[PDB]
Symmetry: D2
Subunit: 490 residues, 4 copies
């Protein structure tokens, strides 16, 4: 008698596609087995019976990597309406197969404890693979031990510091310098939420004092100048500390320019525009419909200058902005409405997880500013290299994870709350038409989207641990450490 | 019997000069009486006997206005070596006839009390006219009343805030915003000492930790980036508050560029390069001679990039930097030497009061970057318009004060401690040769310098009170206030 | 018997005004006699009977100096609809009292002959004072003698070179360098019409080839890039030749930025935005109404980017753009309509002479970007200093010409062809509302506008001759000549 | 009886190396067979006997691709001293395994005929693989047929246009636009030699007129401004034509900035700094030793501003400058000396082919500005993608050509004419010390350099034909063509 092992069904054959990686495009068939890309070539020898997808005339590209989601973060006591299960389903529907969610400790909760609560929730509800950033809401004298445990034991290599939310989680410049020096020693990436909280607080007061209580008060109290200044100050502190810097939620021309200028001076810095900053503008804060206007309330806000998106799109093309995220963090109209009488009480956050891939295509590729290969770079590959999971993600290559999008550059879709996969009533991209969309989405070698139908398994998604010292970040950083030593300076 | 009044001897006739104002140059004679310019013209009818100066082939221009001196400020317990009497003598020797000195309250001393101590000392020792800025070293809840008394009663219309000196006189961004809003309401000018004190403090520690205890540790702990960032943050807060901003001690390209960029965006901001930033560079911090190196220790430091001066000179030419000062604040070698073992204990401050006019001429006019008229602008006229004593100063015009320099554009002088009019042993411009120098200096209608000899009267110099709301500053500011009201915003 | 001379009636008393010069504002009465300002003061001793104007609550400022008009230039065989008489009347109605018109020699006509034809026409028809620029349409080997006669005998100190109009009046870079070297030696100002004619010609062909024959073809064939490039190339050649450069018709952000960057590098260059570039945008080229669209056809075109005007207004505020003109050159709808089937046959030119002062006030002063004093600078004073008739014009000062505007900052007017003083049916500012307008206009000491009525005398206007080597331009240029000699280089 | 085929000896095993590609580094062994990389992995199954190289502790990277050589170009009648054989030997000695040489037709010689002369010479003398750019020295009406034959039949996809050499090979702007439109239609890359020839010619005359006949006259007649302006004008014309642009010999900050600004506006443009612009400065033109100074004479010249190299190195780091070349074109002292009495008669050209890899490492990697992966990008990979031979070159990957450098980052070498592999007496990098050098160089799977000894076979090098429409260039270009069609514009 033979005892026969079971062979798992996360196997498929994709025929006829134009494979698009960040370095080149080429024509070949793709054989997936056990959730991995097993062969890439012509006239591939493959088992009969195998699920077969004909990708002819279409592209086969790595699944999107959303570098920023906030699917479980508490905001003014509110739980986001799209939780890990709905968020990751929405992600898959838009061609994203991996998300990086922000762990945000509630008051009194340590970083490790918050990390464990996130893992508990995500491991049982994630429809696609994921990993976690850890947000530092309070500095204290020994939190280096927490950071150290997180990077050595829990597969985390990025932490976020807040320059805003005065009297809550804002850091001082001294504290920032100290945290960035620790992050550097640990081989981790320093993220920032870059707005001057003290200035925001002063404007919010003045505005409320004059009865400007609607959502336009939110954008008015977060002028572009407080983002640009905070980014510049963060860059400055990071540069002095030789700590690699990652600027979250790049919403303005001024913030993006500061990053581009820093890069020209050799600063190790990354910028993250999000779907909202590429896809809409802040004119809607002044909408006669309060609920619509509130739907845009997020920090930094969607910039009211409608030339912003095109500018940000130019800087994705030139390599100054390297990754795209959503910062997806949604609240219903009822949730937003706690701030009906005071914009400062509106829970901040907006949509973007589902629209990211198509909006990036529409703004960048369909416009002629960038090509398909650059598109892969800024939607998966650069993210994978920055956060240290390349080429596991962000590459159609033998041995990589079978997270694949069969992409149709000729498809067009009008975004609407009528058809979106979110638990909220408004979509900040209502009525925007995008060129480019997924035809098929594959996650872990299984079809998640085909012929307009979703096939998801909440809890199938796995945690992806991330080693410290990613080369793409740290080779420069370590050379600069060694030079400082040789030259006897800090 | 007739009772005959005495006619005072502050009268003279200057013949044959090329009068140079900021708007034009022209040939005419100048008649001074009672310390004022009484007539300007050809074939002037004037009393026989009058002291007569032949200015033929030479220029007659307004006396310099040094917008920044620190002749009585205590630094680490040390009193500056050139006090009000020696400082103003040195000023007159270099063609400056008015100084604006900084009142700096010692700990426990109110602004009004410090103002009164400065007036007591300056009124009895000043060789030329003067006025006072008031430095705010501590924020408290009612200091608006002090500021208000100062501008309404004491002829002060400018106050300085520090962004550096952590744990001593550094303000937070909230406090800065609140002070700038008060300064705006009072019609006064907000000056800043623009360096990020928190970052400076962190670098100083790291450097001392590695035993870099010499004066190069001072420049190394105050990199250009902390000046540029602080200037940008100040500009940002000033702009939000609609408060006119004046950046003191512009020493770097980055700081100057930030101001130039702000001006292009319509921000009401002024920049003040000083003699040291136009005349030398920071290579001397690394001098084998400790005493020489220490002589350069001042904050912000003299920039080590030797292309800095030429850049600053370009921005004086383009109108982005509008005034020149000295920040003169000198300490002997023995005084500096308290920091022999720790650069952070070296009292900060350097020379420049005597060399300002000639160094500006040498760098700006003798190079062909600017003309004689622009030279007057950036050495007296702009200062007079900013601080609200135009055309009393900064103009050869009937009714203006007779503060006049007979200027020789062909003279050349090598600066040296061997011939300078200071009480210190080193000169940061040792061996620098400048084209352009005063032949005659007239203060209050009396000759102070002639044929290389000084004629000074300590205590002759008067306090010049300065009204609030100078048009050159505030017309824009007030229009913006009115527009905010019309548009129902802060 | 006494023989009694006649005393002329170009005398008046203006009481109660706020005098506004470029350097300061102040309250005083103004006494005009014989077309000159005779006294400025309080309690002025003046003849009884004198015409008296009460300017209380209003401003008294120098009459505008329009640095660019084209009132007699032939365009595609067409004579402009507003000739010297109508143009200068329209100018006076908008508070401009001096114009600088461009002499443009027809084919076969020498510069001197064209100059004489312009003088003949202008001397008998000008309602206000004027002077003449001379446009060089053809380079030849001995034209230096013409230029020399013009500056030595005919009171001309500015000449214009064309970089556009390929095969007609475009110069090559060699020729430009040679002309600029001659202009420098003569002490004259080199103006440019800065567009790349070769590129324009290639785009015009492509566009006509695809049947884009409407006025939008005109703007499409003159993209912003050809202006910016030509300005940069002109700046470059001027800098190498040490020849002062004046850029006419600054219509784009790119052109203005090039000038601002040049000034920062110490280049002697002036920029001239015009009413059209501050007051409207190029969206109207796409108007369904052909006649409206054609009304905007001029080169360089009105930029389609509607953020342009605000940018140009920022650069007037920062001092990078120093003068304002109209380039007024109007054609009726019938005249424009020769190009009904081919945009390249539409005669180029648009309005602006009447609206310049109010549009500059509206965009610059009423917005809070600039103050009243800066307004005088960029509307009269800087022009007077550049072209060498300061302080005869551009200053309320004793001995200056009595060209004065009693200006009402609170007046508002909607511009319309229904009320304009032009001979054409369209106004490119139709429906634009401006704050700020003249109440009274005085030219040569006589009232030209009062209570909404014009009082003009065609032929009263005089030619104003302009000496070479204006200091405001040439002091820098001559210093640089002397330095080149000292250093043994060109 | 068996008839046995011969197995060629271009086989080897490289063990223990850190493989460095532009996307990642990783540890693996490399098996080469038949001049190709056959396997990459651990525990590779390989024939016994095979030549084996132990690369432990060292890097294995793609051989350099020198995008610019001029080894056979005639200059003032002179043949370069390092011909194809010596040049390619020198290249291999410095870790470059592929060169792109410029075909330059002598007067009266067609492009095809010059191409055939280059192939004849290179095929029999090249020690490494090569390809050819074709320089267009004269525009004529039918030269499109030559260009077309070259790209369809002769494996050429890049052509160079000259903006300098007035009256010899300079193109006008019209001609440039027409050539760029043809190049675009053919799928080829437009290169430029970007200097304003008309301005250069005028300066050269002035300088010779004042007897400045030495080599400093060469740099003085080619100021940075003529490069920056010409690059901007080229960018402008390329953008209007939608033709991809490649700027050769980027020597100045101004030229590099123009390219960086263009990229930010979405222009398809590449920049090529060369060894000389990264490795030395133009102070040497003023050397007391004429022969040394003449050794630097090349166009554009080595910039006299010694901060230039660091700036260019920053822009390689930020991605604005993507490829590095040598422009190697050497002449002996005797050859240079024909210009002993007139700098304009000195044959232009300098060294760099041998030093490129080490100088790029020294300036970019050893300084901490860039990492090893970026180094591969700018020394081989980007070149391969631009000119359409990726991944055949520029990648350690199975199936790619076995052109490999075993690189030692810890080696240091002082460059000297005493040890260089050139036929000239001077080296413009004399005495420069570089970190980083080749230990072993492999070309076509054969060792060319080992233990400091060269092993070369003149004529082994092959011509590498290059298809049109490289994706890395043309995907953007073709999208923009399609958008123009959709929108009915050129």
């Amino acid at each position: 008698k033979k005892s026969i092992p079971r062979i798992t069904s996360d196997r498929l054959l994709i025929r006829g596609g134009r494979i698009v990686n960040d370095d080149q495009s080429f024509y070949a068939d793709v054989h997936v087995e056990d959730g991995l890309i097993k062969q890439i070539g012509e006239n591939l020898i493959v088992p009969g019976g195998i699920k077969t997808i004909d990708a002819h005339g279409l592209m086969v590209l790595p699944g999107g990597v959303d570098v920023h989601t906030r699917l479980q973060m508490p905001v003014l006591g509110m739980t986001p309406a799209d939780d890990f299960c709905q968020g990751t389903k929405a992600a898959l529907a838009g061609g994203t197969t991996m998300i990086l969610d922000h762990v945000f400790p509630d008051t009194g909760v340590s970083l490790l404890a918050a990390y464990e609560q996130w893992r508990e929730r995500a491991d049982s509800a994630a429809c696609c693979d994921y990993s976690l950033h850890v947000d530092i809401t309070r500095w204290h004298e020994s939190i280096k031990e927490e950071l150290e445990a997180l990077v050595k034991e829990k597969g985390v290599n990025s932490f976020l510091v807040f320059m805003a939310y005065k009297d809550r989680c804002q850091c001082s410049d001294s504290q920032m310098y100290e945290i960035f020096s620790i992050i550097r020693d640990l081989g981790a990436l320093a993220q920032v939420h870059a707005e001057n909280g003290d200035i925001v607080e002063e404007e919010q007061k003045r505005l409320l004092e004059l009865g400007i209580t609607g959502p336009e008060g939110h954008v008015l109290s977060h002028p572009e100048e407080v983002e640009a200044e905070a980014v510049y100050r963060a860059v400055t502190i990071a540069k002095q500390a030789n700590c690699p810097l990652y600027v979250t939620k790049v919403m303005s021309k001024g913030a993006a320019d500061a990053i581009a200028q820093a890069k020209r001076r050799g600063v190790v810095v990354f910028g993250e525009p999000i779907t909202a900053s590429l896809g809409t503008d802040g004119s809607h804060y002044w909408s006669k419909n309060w609920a619509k206007a509130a739907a845009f309330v997020t920090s930094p806000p969607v910039n009211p200058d409608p030339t912003t998106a095109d500018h940000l799109t130019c800087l994705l093309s030139s390599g100054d902005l390297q990754v795209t995220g959503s910062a997806h963090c949604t609240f219903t109209t009822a949730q937003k409405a706690v701030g009906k009488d005071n914009f400062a009480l509106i829970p901040e956050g907006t949509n973007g997880i589902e629209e990211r891939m198509s909006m990036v295509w529409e703004k960048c590729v369909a416009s002629g500013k960038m090509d398909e290969n650059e598109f892969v770079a800024v939607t998966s590959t650069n993210a994978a290299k920055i956060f240290n999971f390349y080429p596991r993600k962000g590459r159609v290559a033998v041995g990589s994870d079978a997270d694949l999008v069969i992409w149709n550059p000729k498809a067009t879709k009008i975004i609407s709350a009528k058809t979106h996969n979110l638990n909220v009533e408004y979509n900040i991209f209502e009525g925007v038409e995008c060129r480019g969309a997924p035809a098929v989405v594959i996650s872990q070698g299984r079809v998640a989207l085909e012929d307009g139908k979703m096939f998801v398994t909440p809890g199938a998604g796995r945690f992806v641990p991330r080693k410290t010292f990613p080369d793409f970040v740290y080779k420069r950083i370590k050379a600069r450490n060694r030079l400082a030593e040789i030259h006897g300076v800090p």
